[PDB]
Symmetry: C3
Subunit: 443 residues, 3 copies
């Protein structure tokens, strides 16, 4: 779509818009299974088969030993605390109840894909992705018993190594992740397996299309939870994201310190909007993601997780156009630390240049085209390739889109430095006003 | 065991207890070795062997190039700063002293497991996990020399690929981890290798049992440090956790913001207990782990690292029953930021619901069964599957255990908002009282 | 070199010096390519080949599906915000322009290494690391067509698995990293490939030597960005670090809380220098890296990234010798939280011991050799192996180098606790003085 951006000189911040939401709001749990074999002079070929067979037995033993316990795993400090795999773990707990695994084993007898309702009413999609039981009970078992121990060909050795390797790698992953992995690898679930899983999922076509067109994101937002080995069934729960909010407007708020620029060192005061992060319209409110690194952007689609959000009044948006607006108390932090830096935005760069710092913007071939004066300023990515603040070189994002420079008096100029409350972190416009009023009162 | 939980309405916090400790207090260093070979018309089979031989030589060269340098690698801000592999690195430094590697090579001549005392008095367990010297000097060397270059069979090609692969993977791991890996993979140390290493370790039976029953945790708390290649010996130090504290009571403290709930926006004041995290009885004091994510829970056993702890007076526990107790100055932060969230506990959910936020608790099949009013409240996981605060859905942990709701007046009601010191982060009950006394004095 | 260290008793801090810089200041983008094949009764050998061929087709399809979108990915809070792969992504965008891939394909027709200037003037080094087109169009295609479907030998099966495996692993990596990986693995770029890439790079001999002697660090500071599949060319951009600052002095500042040690609990005040981290002389200024974990140390060489730095006046160094110096306003935080901890330095250990905490330093064989009294103190690593503060055991670094203990009155003694501004985080000597002056004024 049309990604656009606005820089507000008055508050040293910038909003990038035109993004479309894809928010993980829920979890879907599928049960992925591997059917196992329960099995007991040597030539070179049979020796290899027995070595591979040992790797198979060891992997099973290792996974069994692994499940002796229950499976487990600016404004960010305001977030709540969730339990990411509580739902997957609950489904896994149900799989341990007597008869439960047997239901699944029976379901997948004549097909590899099936929906099974568990005893607690939970309806899970089930998937047998590998039948090692059939392979070992055929092909291999006849050669290790009938002509003890050899009627063997090299192609069988190769084939067994190929088939067993998936089990070995899944086991490797679980072994260094304490039975819980994320992102979900293609060993857990191949691309085709995941795609057909998504297709057979109880979701809308919009969700199926969204997930199929972004499987690499789906993998990053999924968990594989090692669950149970019982009755020749190896089962792990794959916990998949449900995107219950799709195609709502999203915008990214970038902020940077705004300081006075007086000559005398240490006489300057600063203010920074702390409400930077991703914002998405969501159900009459606004979902706010303070750790913008928790969201992943694909073109103009932004994938976030509501577990890492606050739910805010939509008036929080007013802080962008009018930070002194009466409907929402815009959040800021204050300080006297006027250090220089830059924030690279979607479509340009914010530059907070203070003191003796050299701040410039350059083009690839031309070199320096703008030298920043002290204060907070901005340049768009059109005709600009890099920005330098001090010894730090920044490459700007080269995505196409228009920027708008909104001129306005830096609001830091509205404050008397003699009564300015610095070192306020979790503050706001009203809180700062409140403290200023008290300092003025005592004077 | 019996996991139980208590919610304190007065302070918007909850303690989960019944856990048993397993604290890493020390480090054990073992030396793991791979014995290497020092070696110099083609048919298809020999061509493959030579290709595999090149992968072997390259891996050795790569690891040699790698060791041109020395190996290196709310209240969390209060923690000290350690050097995690200082002990392993020190042992590795000793291995570089002349004659030192030769001692090990000699020790493992007729066995794969041996204890060796180093020249500095350190007694290390040593383990030859792979003898590539013997394999290459036999089997392979006779075919690349005698009938230059071919008396070869396909099973030898396969076998060499299998044996060499471990070396290639170990090399891969070290290459993207700058010679220091964690968790320790099954390439570094297979499950059987680790289990027998643990068995031969100079530790108590309780420790051996604990480590053997939790090898996946042991791996996560271990380091593999690439150390030396000298005299056909490849050696890496595996640094294993020593659990010097086992089976002491542990409890997890969950906290959430407690705010007044007045109608007028921005007129509310908040307070949050900052001492959330894991607590374990330890040697007459209490080990406090502020970053509860640094601990791993397996059923009712909790694995932590003392490097990520403070050592506190046991009176810190009093803050749970009486936050105004005279024996310990309970830590809190203050603010006016009354945003809504939930904290998912071991056995329920704390809900901090403020403003216009929709806060509910639901069952799987029934739907909404409780709607929270403004304030801090709690619900147990019995009959509850999810909690929703705003647009954020939380699944609760479904583990069995009893919760106790301890009623009490929210302590935030005891404060006059006109003299309440907000934006205090590293604060406490007494510090807040102290500041209130000064504001009252000037009035 | 000579690593030395000084401990300042007056401020509970220590500086380690003698380090040499290697700062990533820029980015170089190379284009790595894999040439692909565009291809359409069974015996065991051909069945395996067709299975491997399917893995090849699936990998291609998977990577194609992957690129349906644009590629994306105390005092730390003061840092700016960059876009790490903006330059690589920009080059990738250029590769999508018509004719652009064809230029590269033509360039690498008769050689595997070539420099190509793109249409936007960017000169990129290009590298064909694998020719699957040639392998499949030869060897394989003649057997799947001519004697449909079998004139096959087992060595061809093996060889194809070996050659195809790299493609499968690269695909695996991109699949769980959303097309952007770091560190750059040996699948993306083998050690030999990287070394010759570095050799053919447009950089000085000093840089080539530095990068070649530290390829494992180079990998950690590099990105592999999956870019395009078009006209039988698979291309990913590898974004390599440019070290524009080499061999300037670096030093590491360690700090720890300095508190009064009065008997009455809660009557103590504390101060901590917040400017801890790595410092490097750089272009007439000092590059300051607050998150010292963002730098990697190899012997006496320290690798940092300027994106994680502030650019400071060189007078910031004065805070080490004279924290009350008039030329730079040294940064500190204040509190009343007198908890005990230790900071392990390059050549010793800082111990902040308060309250009832047991604080000691030990040798390997002798045991406790020093018991710390309350206050901030230090011990060198000479003759010391461990330090214990409370229940936390610390191993000290055993690297060789001399320490100097600089005696001086703890500056916390210069403050009157009755007017001491605690809970100041982003503070400084002057700011604290300023607040003290106001509290004294109102009294
Ligand atoms: C890891 S850390 O940065 O050190 C956590 C520091 C938390 N902390 C706070 C709250 N706070 C933050 O969270 N950040 C930035 C990390 C986002 C701040 C920046 C500027 N002012 C206060 C900030 N106030 C404190 C007062 C005292 Br005394 C000791 C710690 C304090």
């Amino acid at each position: 779509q049309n990604i656009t951006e606005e820089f507000y000189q008055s508050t040293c911040s910038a909003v990038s818009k035109g993004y479309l939401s894809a928010l993980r709001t829920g979890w879907y749990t599928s049960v992925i299974t591997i059917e196992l074999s329960n099995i007991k002079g040597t030539d070179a070929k049979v020796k290899l088969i027995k070595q591979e067979l040992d790797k198979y037995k060891n992997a099973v033993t290792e996974l069994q030993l692994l499940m002796q316990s229950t499976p487990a795993t600016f404004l960010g400090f305001l977030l709540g605390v969730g339990s990411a795999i509580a739902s997957g773990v609950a489904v896994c707990k149900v799989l341990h109840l007597e008869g439960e695994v047997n239901k699944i084993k029976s379901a997948l007898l004549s097909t590899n894909k099936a929906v099974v309702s568990l005893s607690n009413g939970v309806s899970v999609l089930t998937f047998k992705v590998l039948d090692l039981k059939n392979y070992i009970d055929k092909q291999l078992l006849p050669i290790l018993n009938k002509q003890s121990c050899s009627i063997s060909n090299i192609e069988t050795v190769i084939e067994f190594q190929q088939k067993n390797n998936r089990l070995l790698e899944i086991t490797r992953e679980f072994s260094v992740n304490a039975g819980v992995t994320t992102p979900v690898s293609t060993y857990m679930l191949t691309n085709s397996e995941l795609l057909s899983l998504i297709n057979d999922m109880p979701i809308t076509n919009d969700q199926k299309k969204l997930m199929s067109n972004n499987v690499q994101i789906v993998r990053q937002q999924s968990y594989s939870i090692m669950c149970i080995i019982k009755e020749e069934v190896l089962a792990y729960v794959v916990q998949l994201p449900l995107y219950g909010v799709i195609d709502t407007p999203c915008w990214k708020l970038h902020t940077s310190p705004l300081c006075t620029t007086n000559t005398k060192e240490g006489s300057n005061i600063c203010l920074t909007r702390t409400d930077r992060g991703w914002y998405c319209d969501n159900a009459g409110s606004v979902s706010f993601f303070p750790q913008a690194e928790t969201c992943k952007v694909q073109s103009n689609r932004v994938f976030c997780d509501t577990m890492n959000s606050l739910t805010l009044p939509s008036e929080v948006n007013l802080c962008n156009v009018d930070i002194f607006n009466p409907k929402y108390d815009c959040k800021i932090m204050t300080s006297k630390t006027d250090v220089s830096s830059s924030v690279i935005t979607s479509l340009g760069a914010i530059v907070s240049c203070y003191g003796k710092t050299k701040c410039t913007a350059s083009n690839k071939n031309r070199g320096i085209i703008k030298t920043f004066s002290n204060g907070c300023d901005y340049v768009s990515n059109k005709g600009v390739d890099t920005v330098s603040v001090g010894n730090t070189l920044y490459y700007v994002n080269k995505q196409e889109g228009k920027s708008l420079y909104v001129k306005g008096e830096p609001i830091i100029n509205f404050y008397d430095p003699l009564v300015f409350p610095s070192d306020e972190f979790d503050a706001s416009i009203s809180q700062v006003n409140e403290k200023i009023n008290q300092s003025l009162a005592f004077i």
